[PDB]
Structure formats: structure tokens, C-alpha cells
Amino acid sequence: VHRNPARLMETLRTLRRKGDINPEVSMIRDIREKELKIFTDAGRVYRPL
Amino acid sequence: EGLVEYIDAEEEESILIAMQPEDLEPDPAKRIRVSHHA
Amino acid sequence: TFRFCRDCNNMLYPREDKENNRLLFECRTCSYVEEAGSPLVYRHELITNIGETAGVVQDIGSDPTLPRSDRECPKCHSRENVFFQSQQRRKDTSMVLFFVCLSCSHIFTSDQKNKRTQ
Amino acid sequence: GEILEHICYDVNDWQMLEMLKPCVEDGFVIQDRETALDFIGRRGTALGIKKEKRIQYAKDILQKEFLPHITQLEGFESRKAFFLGYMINRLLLCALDR
Amino acid sequence: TKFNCLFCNHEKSVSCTLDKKNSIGTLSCKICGQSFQTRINSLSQPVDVYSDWFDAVEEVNSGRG
Ligand SMILES: [Zn+2]
Ligand SMILES: [Zn+2]
Ligand SMILES: [Zn+2]
């Protein structure tokens, strides 16, 4: 668990955009459930935006 | 450069997506366009 | 309200003391006994008004997903707000919306007949 | 109390505790790890002795068979307990319709 | 009510009766006549009684009572 979800999520997004982390990884933050999910397994469908 | 980002099915539940680059940001022939409420 | 032993960190069963005519919480594992602060034993809440406003955080208003609104806040008169619906999902739950103000993080119901603090 | 805390994070919500009360009531019979492992190993007997080289077998099954993805080592088995608690919390939330 | 036995080494010769009102588990074999009694709980099963009987037999044989 993490106490500052916003800062961690922003840092992860910045790193992914910069290219340090593979863009294929999917990071989802849910405030209502206060849950952070990171997915790297293959077979996941993604599109560019 | 981070200009374009990959989004999966799960992440789409926690983001808002605009229809066109400049339509939602700012002769009754053109199709009615949804107002930019956000 | 349900508590624990506070010593062994275990649940407490209810019992009746006719000599003292009282409801006492005690666990058969240990000798610890206590007197119930309030006469609450069982509750089912077939219809519950709580749990509809859940998950609110300090940065709730910063979420782009929540839809914005320009309603004047009762206290600070801040037009900017984020409005959502009841968190609980049911086929009979009312469609009453809740508005949260970024400036003060105060949740107020959209209803005007009655004012709800949360 | 530790089991309830793992299952339910926010003690304020008494509905979850009320719904789980029968669970703890029926599970109160077991208080020892060895007894729990023996009971788990009771089913699916294959001509073995529960007290002789079966507690280790049940422990290995729990280490591997139960939530293999989270880990495969016995150094830290609390992650399985936390994941099970989260699963039970989600199940209770779905049951309550929230 | 069919389980293996150790004294006579006969399969399915064991029958277990669980009295939840008295919370007593009784295991009896129809061939060698061996009878054993143990304490049981509402969640008890015949496998539990068999395991308890086997443990008691092992303890008696070892002489570490
Ligand atoms: Zn106690
Ligand atoms: Zn305000
Ligand atoms: Zn026999």
C-alpha cells in the first residue's frame, strides 16, 4: 500500500511518457475504491491516444 | 516524447476522452454535436 | 457498535446477568468481561441510508472523471463543484445526487427540501 | 480480531462485522495452526497418517496451490492471508450491493 | 459409515456414529470388534474420528501416554 497515491501515479505516468517504462504497461487508479492496478501481462488490447 | 500514450480497456474507465482535437476543448446541415459539458 | 476484548484482541459474546440484570460482553476464551456501553446487539438495516457517500478523499475534486458543476457552495459560495450519484447500486435506490466542493471538500445533497451534512 | 481486521479494513462499517459474525462463530472451534492443517488435510485421504508426514504436505499445498501467482516461497506467507482478506472484502461488498 | 481398519487390516469394515447432541464420536469395526470413543464437534466428520482413533493407537503403541 501507498499513502500518497496521487504523487506515485503522477510519477509513474511521467516515467511511462518519458519512455523509461514500457508503454504497454497499463496503470489504473480508482479514487472511489482507492485502488491502483498495474498490468504488464501479454494479451491485453490497447490503443494510442 | 509522451505525445501519444497507450490506453487499455481497464484504464478507459478512469479517463475522459474528447471526440475531436479542437471540438470539445473550446445552414442546419452539419450533424448535431454533443455540447462540451466537461 | 462492536468492540473487542482490548487485551487478547478477540470478539466478545453477549450474556445476560439476571442477578445484576445487565447485558455483558465477555469471551469464553478468557475471563475478561465488560459492560456494554450502549444497548446495541443486532441490526440488519434492510434499507440503509449510509454507504451511498463512500470513497471520498482529499483529492476527490481533482479527478477529471467526476462531472463538474457551477452550483454555489452554501458556506464559501464557491461555484466550482463535482457532482456524483449514490455509491451503492440497487434497483430501488433514489437518484439523489451529491455535490462536493473543492475549496472545502464538503458533501451536500442536491435535494432542497432537506439539507444533509454528508 | 486479526482475522476480522484483515477481512474488514474500516472498523466503522459494522454491517460487514454483523454479516461475518456467523463465520467467526463457526470457525471458533479451531484455535491452533496444526489443527487447521490437519482439518484441511482430512479431505482427499490417500492412505496417509494426518499426524505423520501430512501436516508438511498440507503446508506445501497451501504454499503452492493457494494463490500460486502472488508468491511461491514460505518466507512470507502473510501476503496470501492479505489477498484472501481482500477477496472476502470484495465478496462482502458485492453481497451488500455497494 | 465404511472405512478401513488397522487391527484386522480389512477395508470398509469400520462404521462411525456421531452424536452431536452428546458430541460423541464412536468408531466400531464389524469384524475384530474393536470400539473407540472420542469427543467431536458439530463440524466433525467420520474422517476426523478415524484420524483421532489412529493417533490414539499410535500413542498407545509408542507408550508415551
Ligand atoms: Zn477476551
Ligand atoms: Zn465549498
Ligand atoms: Zn477391524
mmCIF file of N, CA, C and O in Angstrom, chain C residues 9-78:
data_model
loop_
_atom_site.group_PDB
_atom_site.id
_atom_site.type_symbol
_atom_site.label_atom_id
_atom_site.label_comp_id
_atom_site.label_asym_id
_atom_site.label_seq_id
_atom_site.Cartn_x
_atom_site.Cartn_y
_atom_site.Cartn_z
ATOM 1 N N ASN C 9 -7.447 -9.251 21.883
ATOM 2 C CA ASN C 9 -7.843 -8.919 20.516
ATOM 3 C C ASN C 9 -8.753 -10.007 19.940
ATOM 4 O O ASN C 9 -8.432 -10.674 18.953
ATOM 5 N N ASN C 10 -9.905 -10.177 20.585
ATOM 6 C CA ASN C 10 -10.883 -11.177 20.181
ATOM 7 C C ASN C 10 -12.285 -10.618 20.376
ATOM 8 O O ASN C 10 -12.492 -9.639 21.098
ATOM 9 N N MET C 11 -13.247 -11.253 19.715
ATOM 10 C CA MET C 11 -14.638 -10.843 19.829
ATOM 11 C C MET C 11 -15.181 -11.169 21.218
ATOM 12 O O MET C 11 -14.615 -11.971 21.966
ATOM 13 N N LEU C 12 -16.299 -10.531 21.558
ATOM 14 C CA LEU C 12 -16.959 -10.715 22.843
ATOM 15 C C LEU C 12 -18.395 -11.164 22.616
ATOM 16 O O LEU C 12 -19.153 -10.497 21.904
ATOM 17 N N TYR C 13 -18.765 -12.293 23.221
ATOM 18 C CA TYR C 13 -20.136 -12.768 23.145
ATOM 19 C C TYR C 13 -21.019 -12.019 24.145
ATOM 20 O O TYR C 13 -20.548 -11.602 25.207
ATOM 21 N N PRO C 14 -22.302 -11.837 23.831
ATOM 22 C CA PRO C 14 -23.217 -11.212 24.792
ATOM 23 C C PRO C 14 -23.830 -12.225 25.746
ATOM 24 O O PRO C 14 -24.118 -13.369 25.387
ATOM 25 N N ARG C 15 -24.031 -11.788 26.988
ATOM 26 C CA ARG C 15 -24.640 -12.623 28.013
ATOM 27 C C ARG C 15 -25.503 -11.753 28.915
ATOM 28 O O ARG C 15 -25.307 -10.539 29.017
ATOM 29 N N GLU C 16 -26.465 -12.391 29.572
ATOM 30 C CA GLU C 16 -27.398 -11.718 30.465
ATOM 31 C C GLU C 16 -27.094 -12.108 31.903
ATOM 32 O O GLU C 16 -26.985 -13.297 32.220
ATOM 33 N N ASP C 17 -26.959 -11.105 32.768
ATOM 34 C CA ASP C 17 -26.750 -11.304 34.198
ATOM 35 C C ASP C 17 -28.046 -10.901 34.893
ATOM 36 O O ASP C 17 -28.321 -9.710 35.074
ATOM 37 N N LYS C 18 -28.847 -11.903 35.265
ATOM 38 C CA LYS C 18 -30.115 -11.632 35.934
ATOM 39 C C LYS C 18 -29.902 -11.092 37.341
ATOM 40 O O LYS C 18 -30.698 -10.272 37.814
ATOM 41 N N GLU C 19 -28.845 -11.535 38.026
ATOM 42 C CA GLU C 19 -28.561 -11.006 39.356
ATOM 43 C C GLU C 19 -28.313 -9.505 39.298
ATOM 44 O O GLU C 19 -28.828 -8.748 40.129
ATOM 45 N N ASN C 20 -27.525 -9.056 38.322
ATOM 46 C CA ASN C 20 -27.339 -7.635 38.068
ATOM 47 C C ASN C 20 -28.284 -7.100 37.001
ATOM 48 O O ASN C 20 -28.353 -5.880 36.814
ATOM 49 N N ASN C 21 -29.011 -7.974 36.308
ATOM 50 C CA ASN C 21 -29.946 -7.574 35.260
ATOM 51 C C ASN C 21 -29.262 -6.644 34.259
ATOM 52 O O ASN C 21 -29.642 -5.485 34.079
ATOM 53 N N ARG C 22 -28.233 -7.175 33.601
ATOM 54 C CA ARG C 22 -27.432 -6.366 32.693
ATOM 55 C C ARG C 22 -26.946 -7.222 31.532
ATOM 56 O O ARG C 22 -26.850 -8.449 31.629
ATOM 57 N N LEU C 23 -26.642 -6.551 30.423
ATOM 58 C CA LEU C 23 -26.064 -7.183 29.244
ATOM 59 C C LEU C 23 -24.555 -6.977 29.286
ATOM 60 O O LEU C 23 -24.082 -5.836 29.311
ATOM 61 N N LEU C 24 -23.804 -8.076 29.294
ATOM 62 C CA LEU C 24 -22.358 -8.043 29.453
ATOM 63 C C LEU C 24 -21.684 -8.703 28.258
ATOM 64 O O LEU C 24 -22.144 -9.735 27.761
ATOM 65 N N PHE C 25 -20.587 -8.103 27.805
ATOM 66 C CA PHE C 25 -19.783 -8.645 26.718
ATOM 67 C C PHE C 25 -18.586 -9.376 27.314
ATOM 68 O O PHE C 25 -17.790 -8.781 28.051
ATOM 69 N N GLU C 26 -18.465 -10.665 27.000
ATOM 70 C CA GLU C 26 -17.376 -11.482 27.513
ATOM 71 C C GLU C 26 -17.091 -12.606 26.530
ATOM 72 O O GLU C 26 -18.001 -13.133 25.884
ATOM 73 N N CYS C 27 -15.817 -12.971 26.426
ATOM 74 C CA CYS C 27 -15.367 -14.056 25.566
ATOM 75 C C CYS C 27 -15.019 -15.261 26.428
ATOM 76 O O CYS C 27 -14.276 -15.135 27.406
ATOM 77 N N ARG C 28 -15.557 -16.426 26.062
ATOM 78 C CA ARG C 28 -15.323 -17.632 26.848
ATOM 79 C C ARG C 28 -13.860 -18.055 26.841
ATOM 80 O O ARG C 28 -13.453 -18.841 27.705
ATOM 81 N N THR C 29 -13.062 -17.559 25.894
ATOM 82 C CA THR C 29 -11.648 -17.920 25.857
ATOM 83 C C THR C 29 -10.923 -17.438 27.107
ATOM 84 O O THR C 29 -10.090 -18.159 27.668
ATOM 85 N N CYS C 30 -11.227 -16.224 27.556
ATOM 86 C CA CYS C 30 -10.587 -15.620 28.715
ATOM 87 C C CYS C 30 -11.644 -15.206 29.732
ATOM 88 O O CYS C 30 -12.848 -15.321 29.499
ATOM 89 N N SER C 31 -11.171 -14.721 30.878
ATOM 90 C CA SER C 31 -12.044 -14.269 31.953
ATOM 91 C C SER C 31 -12.449 -12.808 31.815
ATOM 92 O O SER C 31 -13.205 -12.309 32.655
ATOM 93 N N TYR C 32 -11.970 -12.112 30.786
ATOM 94 C CA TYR C 32 -12.289 -10.700 30.625
ATOM 95 C C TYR C 32 -13.784 -10.509 30.405
ATOM 96 O O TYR C 32 -14.406 -11.223 29.613
ATOM 97 N N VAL C 33 -14.358 -9.538 31.114
ATOM 98 C CA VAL C 33 -15.765 -9.183 30.979
ATOM 99 C C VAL C 33 -15.871 -7.665 30.962
ATOM 100 O O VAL C 33 -15.028 -6.960 31.524
ATOM 101 N N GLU C 34 -16.916 -7.159 30.308
ATOM 102 C CA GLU C 34 -17.138 -5.723 30.247
ATOM 103 C C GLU C 34 -18.633 -5.455 30.158
ATOM 104 O O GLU C 34 -19.418 -6.320 29.761
ATOM 105 N N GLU C 35 -19.018 -4.239 30.537
ATOM 106 C CA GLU C 35 -20.403 -3.796 30.475
ATOM 107 C C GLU C 35 -20.625 -3.029 29.178
ATOM 108 O O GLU C 35 -19.853 -2.124 28.846
ATOM 109 N N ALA C 36 -21.679 -3.394 28.450
ATOM 110 C CA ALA C 36 -21.959 -2.751 27.174
ATOM 111 C C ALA C 36 -22.202 -1.261 27.369
ATOM 112 O O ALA C 36 -22.995 -0.853 28.223
ATOM 113 N N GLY C 37 -21.513 -0.446 26.569
ATOM 114 C CA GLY C 37 -21.709 0.992 26.652
ATOM 115 C C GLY C 37 -23.095 1.417 26.204
ATOM 116 O O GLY C 37 -23.718 2.285 26.822
ATOM 117 N N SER C 38 -23.592 0.817 25.128
ATOM 118 C CA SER C 38 -24.906 1.115 24.585
ATOM 119 C C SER C 38 -25.661 -0.183 24.341
ATOM 120 O O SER C 38 -25.047 -1.215 24.050
ATOM 121 N N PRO C 39 -26.995 -0.166 24.451
ATOM 122 C CA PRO C 39 -27.775 -1.404 24.260
ATOM 123 C C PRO C 39 -27.958 -1.762 22.787
ATOM 124 O O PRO C 39 -29.072 -1.791 22.256
ATOM 125 N N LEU C 40 -26.846 -2.041 22.114
ATOM 126 C CA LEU C 40 -26.843 -2.471 20.720
ATOM 127 C C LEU C 40 -26.327 -3.902 20.656
ATOM 128 O O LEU C 40 -25.225 -4.190 21.137
ATOM 129 N N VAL C 41 -27.122 -4.792 20.064
ATOM 130 C CA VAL C 41 -26.761 -6.202 19.959
ATOM 131 C C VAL C 41 -26.785 -6.625 18.497
ATOM 132 O O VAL C 41 -25.769 -7.073 17.952
ATOM 133 N N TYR C 42 -27.942 -6.487 17.852
ATOM 134 C CA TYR C 42 -28.131 -6.928 16.478
ATOM 135 C C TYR C 42 -28.786 -5.823 15.662
ATOM 136 O O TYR C 42 -29.588 -5.038 16.176
ATOM 137 N N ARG C 43 -28.430 -5.772 14.381
ATOM 138 C CA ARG C 43 -29.003 -4.808 13.453
ATOM 139 C C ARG C 43 -28.759 -5.306 12.037
ATOM 140 O O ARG C 43 -27.653 -5.750 11.714
ATOM 141 N N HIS C 44 -29.792 -5.230 11.198
ATOM 142 C CA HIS C 44 -29.711 -5.709 9.823
ATOM 143 C C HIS C 44 -29.747 -4.600 8.784
ATOM 144 O O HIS C 44 -29.078 -4.719 7.755
ATOM 145 N N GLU C 45 -30.502 -3.526 9.023
ATOM 146 C CA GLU C 45 -30.576 -2.388 8.106
ATOM 147 C C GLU C 45 -30.990 -2.846 6.703
ATOM 148 O O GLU C 45 -30.228 -2.774 5.736
ATOM 149 N N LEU C 46 -32.230 -3.334 6.627
ATOM 150 C CA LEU C 46 -32.773 -3.781 5.348
ATOM 151 C C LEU C 46 -32.634 -2.689 4.293
ATOM 152 O O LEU C 46 -32.190 -2.945 3.169
ATOM 153 N N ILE C 47 -33.008 -1.462 4.645
ATOM 154 C CA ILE C 47 -32.766 -0.286 3.817
ATOM 155 C C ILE C 47 -31.812 0.616 4.586
ATOM 156 O O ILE C 47 -32.089 0.988 5.734
ATOM 157 N N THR C 48 -30.683 0.948 3.966
ATOM 158 C CA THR C 48 -29.616 1.697 4.618
ATOM 159 C C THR C 48 -29.389 3.008 3.882
ATOM 160 O O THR C 48 -29.263 3.023 2.653
ATOM 161 N N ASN C 49 -29.343 4.105 4.637
ATOM 162 C CA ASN C 49 -29.036 5.416 4.083
ATOM 163 C C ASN C 49 -27.545 5.725 4.099
ATOM 164 O O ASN C 49 -27.132 6.741 3.530
ATOM 165 N N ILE C 50 -26.733 4.878 4.726
ATOM 166 C CA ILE C 50 -25.294 5.068 4.777
ATOM 167 C C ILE C 50 -24.649 4.196 3.709
ATOM 168 O O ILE C 50 -25.241 3.241 3.199
ATOM 169 N N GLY C 51 -23.406 4.533 3.364
ATOM 170 C CA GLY C 51 -22.678 3.836 2.328
ATOM 171 C C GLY C 51 -22.876 4.389 0.935
ATOM 172 O O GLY C 51 -22.162 3.974 0.013
ATOM 173 N N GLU C 52 -23.824 5.312 0.749
ATOM 174 C CA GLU C 52 -24.006 5.932 -0.558
ATOM 175 C C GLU C 52 -22.909 6.945 -0.853
ATOM 176 O O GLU C 52 -22.556 7.154 -2.019
ATOM 177 N N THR C 53 -22.364 7.581 0.180
ATOM 178 C CA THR C 53 -21.267 8.537 0.051
ATOM 179 C C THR C 53 -20.023 7.881 0.644
ATOM 180 O O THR C 53 -19.728 8.030 1.831
ATOM 181 N N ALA C 54 -19.292 7.150 -0.195
ATOM 182 C CA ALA C 54 -18.101 6.430 0.224
ATOM 183 C C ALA C 54 -16.988 6.650 -0.790
ATOM 184 O O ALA C 54 -17.234 6.943 -1.963
ATOM 185 N N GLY C 55 -15.751 6.505 -0.319
ATOM 186 C CA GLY C 55 -14.586 6.684 -1.159
ATOM 187 C C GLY C 55 -14.114 8.113 -1.306
ATOM 188 O O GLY C 55 -13.144 8.352 -2.037
ATOM 189 N N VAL C 56 -14.762 9.071 -0.642
ATOM 190 C CA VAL C 56 -14.353 10.464 -0.753
ATOM 191 C C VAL C 56 -12.962 10.640 -0.161
ATOM 192 O O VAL C 56 -12.653 10.118 0.920
ATOM 193 N N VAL C 57 -12.111 11.377 -0.873
ATOM 194 C CA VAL C 57 -10.744 11.647 -0.455
ATOM 195 C C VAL C 57 -10.477 13.140 -0.608
ATOM 196 O O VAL C 57 -11.282 13.885 -1.168
ATOM 197 N N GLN C 58 -9.323 13.570 -0.095
ATOM 198 C CA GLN C 58 -8.969 14.984 -0.163
ATOM 199 C C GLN C 58 -8.843 15.451 -1.608
ATOM 200 O O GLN C 58 -9.264 16.563 -1.948
ATOM 201 N N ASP C 59 -8.268 14.615 -2.476
ATOM 202 C CA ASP C 59 -8.103 14.936 -3.888
ATOM 203 C C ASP C 59 -9.260 14.430 -4.742
ATOM 204 O O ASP C 59 -9.081 14.182 -5.942
ATOM 205 N N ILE C 60 -10.447 14.266 -4.152
ATOM 206 C CA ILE C 60 -11.593 13.771 -4.910
ATOM 207 C C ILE C 60 -11.963 14.752 -6.016
ATOM 208 O O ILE C 60 -12.250 14.352 -7.151
ATOM 209 N N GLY C 61 -11.959 16.050 -5.708
ATOM 210 C CA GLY C 61 -12.353 17.049 -6.685
ATOM 211 C C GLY C 61 -11.401 17.183 -7.853
ATOM 212 O O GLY C 61 -11.787 17.727 -8.893
ATOM 213 N N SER C 62 -10.168 16.702 -7.709
ATOM 214 C CA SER C 62 -9.178 16.796 -8.774
ATOM 215 C C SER C 62 -9.325 15.700 -9.820
ATOM 216 O O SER C 62 -8.609 15.732 -10.828
ATOM 217 N N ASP C 63 -10.219 14.743 -9.616
ATOM 218 C CA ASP C 63 -10.393 13.660 -10.575
ATOM 219 C C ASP C 63 -11.106 14.180 -11.818
ATOM 220 O O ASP C 63 -12.230 14.686 -11.706
ATOM 221 N N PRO C 64 -10.508 14.083 -13.010
ATOM 222 C CA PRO C 64 -11.226 14.530 -14.216
ATOM 223 C C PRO C 64 -12.516 13.771 -14.465
ATOM 224 O O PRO C 64 -13.437 14.320 -15.085
ATOM 225 N N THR C 65 -12.610 12.523 -14.003
ATOM 226 C CA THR C 65 -13.786 11.711 -14.298
ATOM 227 C C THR C 65 -15.048 12.324 -13.705
ATOM 228 O O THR C 65 -16.106 12.326 -14.347
ATOM 229 N N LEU C 66 -14.963 12.845 -12.486
ATOM 230 C CA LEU C 66 -16.142 13.396 -11.840
ATOM 231 C C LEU C 66 -16.667 14.586 -12.643
ATOM 232 O O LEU C 66 -15.883 15.445 -13.062
ATOM 233 N N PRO C 67 -17.979 14.673 -12.878
ATOM 234 C CA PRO C 67 -18.509 15.775 -13.691
ATOM 235 C C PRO C 67 -18.650 17.058 -12.881
ATOM 236 O O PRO C 67 -19.181 17.059 -11.765
ATOM 237 N N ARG C 68 -18.184 18.158 -13.469
ATOM 238 C CA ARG C 68 -18.169 19.454 -12.813
ATOM 239 C C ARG C 68 -19.555 20.094 -12.825
ATOM 240 O O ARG C 68 -20.443 19.720 -13.596
ATOM 241 N N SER C 69 -19.722 21.077 -11.945
ATOM 242 C CA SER C 69 -20.945 21.864 -11.865
ATOM 243 C C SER C 69 -20.606 23.217 -11.258
ATOM 244 O O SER C 69 -19.610 23.368 -10.544
ATOM 245 N N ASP C 70 -21.457 24.201 -11.541
ATOM 246 C CA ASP C 70 -21.242 25.584 -11.130
ATOM 247 C C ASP C 70 -22.248 26.024 -10.070
ATOM 248 O O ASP C 70 -22.704 27.168 -10.062
ATOM 249 N N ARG C 71 -22.607 25.119 -9.162
ATOM 250 C CA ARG C 71 -23.522 25.458 -8.082
ATOM 251 C C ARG C 71 -22.779 26.171 -6.960
ATOM 252 O O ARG C 71 -21.646 25.818 -6.620
ATOM 253 N N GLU C 72 -23.428 27.180 -6.384
ATOM 254 C CA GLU C 72 -22.811 27.960 -5.320
ATOM 255 C C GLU C 72 -22.790 27.160 -4.023
ATOM 256 O O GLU C 72 -23.822 26.645 -3.582
ATOM 257 N N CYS C 73 -21.612 27.057 -3.414
ATOM 258 C CA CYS C 73 -21.487 26.302 -2.177
ATOM 259 C C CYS C 73 -22.204 27.034 -1.042
ATOM 260 O O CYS C 73 -22.146 28.265 -0.966
ATOM 261 N N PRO C 74 -22.889 26.311 -0.150
ATOM 262 C CA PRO C 74 -23.605 27.006 0.936
ATOM 263 C C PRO C 74 -22.709 27.857 1.819
ATOM 264 O O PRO C 74 -23.130 28.935 2.258
ATOM 265 N N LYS C 75 -21.483 27.410 2.095
ATOM 266 C CA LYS C 75 -20.628 28.091 3.065
ATOM 267 C C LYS C 75 -19.698 29.105 2.402
ATOM 268 O O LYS C 75 -19.762 30.301 2.703
ATOM 269 N N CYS C 76 -18.834 28.644 1.502
ATOM 270 C CA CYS C 76 -17.838 29.502 0.875
ATOM 271 C C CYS C 76 -18.310 30.103 -0.443
ATOM 272 O O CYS C 76 -17.563 30.872 -1.057
ATOM 273 N N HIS C 77 -19.522 29.778 -0.888
ATOM 274 C CA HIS C 77 -20.084 30.349 -2.112
ATOM 275 C C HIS C 77 -19.173 30.095 -3.311
ATOM 276 O O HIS C 77 -19.017 30.947 -4.188
ATOM 277 N N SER C 78 -18.568 28.911 -3.352
ATOM 278 C CA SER C 78 -17.699 28.519 -4.454
ATOM 279 C C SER C 78 -18.530 27.806 -5.513
ATOM 280 O O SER C 78 -19.122 26.755 -5.243
#
